[PDB]
Amino acid sequence: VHLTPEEKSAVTALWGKVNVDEVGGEALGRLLVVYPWTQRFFESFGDLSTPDAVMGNPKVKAHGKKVLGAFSDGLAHLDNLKGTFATLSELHCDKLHVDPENFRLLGNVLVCVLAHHFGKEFTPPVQAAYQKVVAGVANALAHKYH
Amino acid sequence: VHLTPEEKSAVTALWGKVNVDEVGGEALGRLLVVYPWTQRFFESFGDLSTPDAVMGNPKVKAHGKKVLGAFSDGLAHLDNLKGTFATLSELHCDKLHVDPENFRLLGNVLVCVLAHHFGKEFTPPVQAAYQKVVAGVANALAHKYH
Amino acid sequence: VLSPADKTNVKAAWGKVGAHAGEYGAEALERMFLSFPTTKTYFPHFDLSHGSAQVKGHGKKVADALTNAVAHVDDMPNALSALSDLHAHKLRVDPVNFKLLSHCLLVTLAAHLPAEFTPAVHASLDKFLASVSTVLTSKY
Amino acid sequence: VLSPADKTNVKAAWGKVGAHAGEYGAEALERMFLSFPTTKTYFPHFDLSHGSAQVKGHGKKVADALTNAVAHVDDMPNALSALSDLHAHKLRVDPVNFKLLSHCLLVTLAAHLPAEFTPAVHASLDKFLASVSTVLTSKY
Ligand code: HEM
Ligand code: HEM
Ligand code: HEM
Numbered sequence: 079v080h081l082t083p084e085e086k087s088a089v090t091a092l093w094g095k096v097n098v099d100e101v102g103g104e105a106l107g108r109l110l111v112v113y114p115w116t117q118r119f120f121e122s123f124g125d126l127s128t129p130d131a132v133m134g135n136p137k138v139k140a141h142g143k144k145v146l147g148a149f150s151d152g153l154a155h156l157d158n159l160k161g162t163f164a165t166l167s168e169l170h171c172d173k174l175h176v177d178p179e180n181f182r183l184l185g186n187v188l189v190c191v192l193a194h195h196f197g198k199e200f201t202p203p204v205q206a207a208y209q210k211v212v213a214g215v216a217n218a219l220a221h222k223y224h
Numbered sequence: 225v226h227l228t229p230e231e232k233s234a235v236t237a238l239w240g241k242v243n244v245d246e247v248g249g250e251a252l253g254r255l256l257v258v259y260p261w262t263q264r265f266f267e268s269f270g271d272l273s274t275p276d277a278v279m280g281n282p283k284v285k286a287h288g289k290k291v292l293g294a295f296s297d298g299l300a301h302l303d304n305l306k307g308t309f310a311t312l313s314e315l316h317c318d319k320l321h322v323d324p325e326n327f328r329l330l331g332n333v334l335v336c337v338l339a340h341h342f343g344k345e346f347t348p349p350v351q352a353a354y355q356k357v358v359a360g361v362a363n364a365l366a367h368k369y370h
Numbered sequence: 371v372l373s374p375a376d377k378t379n380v381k382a383a384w385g386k387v388g389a390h391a392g393e394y395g396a397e398a399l400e401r402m403f404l405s406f407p408t409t410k411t412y413f414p415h416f417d418l419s420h421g422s423a424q425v426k427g428h429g430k431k432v433a434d435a436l437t438n439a440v441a442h443v444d445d446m447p448n449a450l451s452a453l454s455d456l457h458a459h460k461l462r463v464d465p466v467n468f469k470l471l472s473h474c475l476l477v478t479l480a481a482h483l484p485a486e487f488t489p490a491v492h493a494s495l496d497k498f499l500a501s502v503s504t505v506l507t508s509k510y
Numbered sequence: 511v512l513s514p515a516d517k518t519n520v521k522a523a524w525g526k527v528g529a530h531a532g533e534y535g536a537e538a539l540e541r542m543f544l545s546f547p548t549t550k551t552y553f554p555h556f557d558l559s560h561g562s563a564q565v566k567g568h569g570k571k572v573a574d575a576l577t578n579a580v581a582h583v584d585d586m587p588n589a590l591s592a593l594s595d596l597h598a599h600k601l602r603v604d605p606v607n608f609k610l611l612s613h614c615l616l617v618t619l620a621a622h623l624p625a626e627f628t629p630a631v632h633a634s635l636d637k638f639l640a641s642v643s644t645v646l647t648s649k650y
C-alpha cells in the first residue's frame with residue numbers, strides 16, 4: 079500500500095507510543111469477545127466463558143503480543159506486505175483455514191483499541207491512514223487464497 | 225490465480241460454448257435485479273422499474289456484452305490478472321467508486337447464469353474452478369483500492 | 371421483509387424441486403466444499419468425498435430445515451430458533467459461511483430448474499436465503 | 511437478538527455520550543469519508559470538508575435516529591421503517607456501507623469514552639449497530 083508522507087507520519091508517530099506488551103492482547107481479547115465465532119480457533123486457550131475471563135486470560139495476552147509483533151513488522155515494510163506476510167498467509171490460509179473476512183475484522187478491532195488508548199489524538203486523518211494500513215495487512219495475509 | 229490443468233480444462237471447455245452476445249447481459253441484468261443498489265450506477269440506462277424491463281433493456285444487453293468481453297480477457301490471462309485489469313480498476317475504483325464487494329457479487333451472479341445455461345454440465349468441480357476465476361478478477365479489479 | 375411476490379416465487383420453486391430437495395441439498399454442500407475449502411473444517415468427522423452417505427444425510431437435513439422455513443415463512447425466527455442456537459453457540463459458524471452456502475444453494479437450483487430460475491425468482495430466492503441466514507446468525 | 515445485558519450496556523454508553531451525540535455523529539461521518547472514500551459519492555451536494563455545517567447538521571440527524579432506535583430497542587423495525595425505505599429504495603445505499611459507518615461510530619465512542627468502552631460494552635454496541643444496520647437494509 080502507498081501511504082503519503084503525511085499518512086506515514088501519522089502512523090509512525092502514534093505507533094512509537096503504543097504499549098507493545100499490551101495492545102495486541104487487548105485487540106485479540108476484544109476480537110474474541112465481539113466476534114465470538116473466532117473463539118473457534120482458540121479452543122486450547124482455556125476459559126473464554128466471559129469478557130473478563132478473555133481479557134485476563136494469560137494465553138490471550140501472550141498470543142496477542144505475537145500478533146502485534148507481526149503488525150509492527152508490516153509497518154516497517156509498507157511497500158512489501160506481500161513478502162513480509164507470506165509465511166503467516168500460508169499458515170492462516172493453508173493450515174488454519176481462517177476466513178479472511180476475519181483479518182479485516184481484527185484490523186478494525188485494533189483501530190478501535192488505538193482510538194480507545196489515544197482518544198483525541200486518534201484524529202479522523204490518523205484513523206484513515208491506519209485503515210489503509212490494516213487493509214494492506216489483511217490483504218497480504220489473505221494472498222494464499224487469491 | 226493458479227488453476228490446475230484440470231481446472232483450466234474445465235473452464236475453457238465450458239467457455240467456448242458460451243453465447244458471448246447474451247451471457248454478459250443476462251449476468252448484468254440479474255445483478256441489477258437481485259442487488260438493486262447496483263442500479264445506482266446505471267441511472268442513465270433508463271427503465272429499470274421491473275425485472276422484464278431490466279432484462280429486455282437494450283442498454284443492459286449492450287453493456288453486459290463489454291463486461292463479458294473483459295471476463296473473456298482474464299480467462300486468456302489467468303497468470304496476469306493484475307496487469308489485464310489495471311485500466312478497468314482505475315475506472316471502477318478512482319472514477320466510479322463502486323464498492324469491490326460488488327465485483328464479487330457480479331462474479332457469483334455470472335456463476336449462477338452459467339449454472340442456469342449449462343445445467344448438469346456445470347458440475348461441482350467445474351463451479352470450483354470458475355469460483356477461483358471470478359475471485360481472481362474481482363481481486364484484480366479492486367487493486368486500485370489495495 | 372419478504373414480499374407476497376417473493377413468498378409466491380419461493381413456494382413455486384420449492385414445488386418444482388419436489389422430492390429432489392435432499393439430493394439438491396447434498397449437491398449444494400459438495401459445491402460449497404469444493405468451491406470454498408475453508409468451509410470443510412466444520413465437518414472434520416465427515417467423509418466429504420463424492421457419494422458420501424454422510425454428505426447425503428446432511429443434505430437432507432439442510433433441505434428439510436429450509437422447507438420448514440418456507441412453510442413458516444412469517445415466523446422464521448421461531449421456527450429456526452433451535453438451529454440458530456446450534457450454529458451460533460455450539461458450532462460457532464462464521465457468518466461469512468452462510469453467504470457461501472446460500473450462493474451454492476442458488477447455483478444448485480439454477481442447474482436443475484431451467485424454467486423456474488428466472489431473474490425475479492432468483493431475486494426472491496436470494497432474499498429468502500438471506501433471511502434464513504439472518505435468523506441463523508442472530509444468536510452470537 | 512439484543513440481550514438484557516446488551517440493552518443495559520447501550521443505554522449506559524448513550525447516557526455518558528449525553529448531549530455530545532450530534533457532534534459525535536458528525537465526527538463519525540468525517541471518519542467514514544476520510545477512511546472509506548467510496549462513501550463520499552452519496553453526498554455529492556455536501557461540502558465534506560472539516561467544520562462543514564452540512565456534515566454537522568447530518569451528524570445530528572444520524573445520532574437522533576440512533577437515539578430513537580435505543581429508545582425503541584424492542585420495536586426497531588417499526589421505529590426505523592421510514593428510514594429503511596429511504597436508504598434502500600431512494601438512496602440505494604450499498605449494504606457494505608452500513609458496516610463502514612458502524613465501525614466509525616464505534617471508533618468515535620472509543621475515542622471519547624475511555625471508561626465506558628470496555629470489551630463487554632464494545633460487544634453490546636457492535637450488536638446494536640448491526641441490528642440497526644439489519645433494519646436499515648431490510649427493504650431492498
Ligand atoms: C489480522 C491479522 C492477523 C495477524 C497479523 C496474525 C498473526 C499471527 C501470528 C504472528 C501467529 C503466530 C504464528 C507463529 O507462531 O509462528 C498467529 C497464529 C495464529 N493465528 Fe493469527 N493473525 C491474524 C489474524 C488471525 C485471525 C483473524 C484468526 C482467527 C480468528 C487467527 C488465528 C490464529 C491461530 C489459530 C494461530 C495459531 C496457529 C498455530 O500456531 O498453529 N489469526 N497469528
Ligand atoms: C465484476 C466485474 C466487472 C467487470 C469485468 C466490469 C467491466 C466493465 C467494462 C469492461 C466497462 C466499460 C469500460 C469502458 O467503456 O472502457 C465497465 C463500465 C462500467 N462498470 Fe463495470 N465491470 C465490473 C463490475 C462492475 C460493478 C459491480 C459495477 C457497479 C455495480 C460496475 C459499474 C460500471 C459502470 C457504471 C460503468 C460505466 C462507466 C463509464 O463508462 O463511465 N461495474 N465495466
Ligand atoms: C441455509 C443455511 C443452513 C441450514 C438451513 C443449516 C441446517 C442445519 C441443520 C438442519 C443441522 C442439523 C443436523 C442434525 O440435526 O443432525 C445443521 C448442523 C450443522 N451445520 Fe448447518 N445449516 C446451515 C448453514 C451452515 C453453514 C454455513 C455451516 C458451516 C459451513 C454449517 C455447519 C453445520 C455443522 C458443522 C453442523 C453439525 C453437523 C454434524 O456434526 O453432524 N451450517 N445445519
Ligand code: HEM
Pocket residue numbers: 549552553571572575576593597601603607608611612642643646
Ligand atoms: C447507522 C446507520 C445510519 C443511520 C442511523 C442513518 C440515518 C439517516 C437519517 C436520520 C437520514 C435523514 C436526514 C434527513 O431527514 O434530512 C439519512 C439520510 C441519508 N443517509 Fe443515512 N443513516 C445511516 C447510514 C447511512 C449510510 C451507510 C449511508 C451511505 C454511506 C447513508 C447515506 C445517507 C444519505 C445520502 C442521506 C440523504 C442525505 C441528504 O441529501 O441530505 N446513510 N440517514
Ligand SMILES: O=N[O-]
Pocket residue numbers: 605606
Ligand atoms: O451486508 N451483509 O453482510
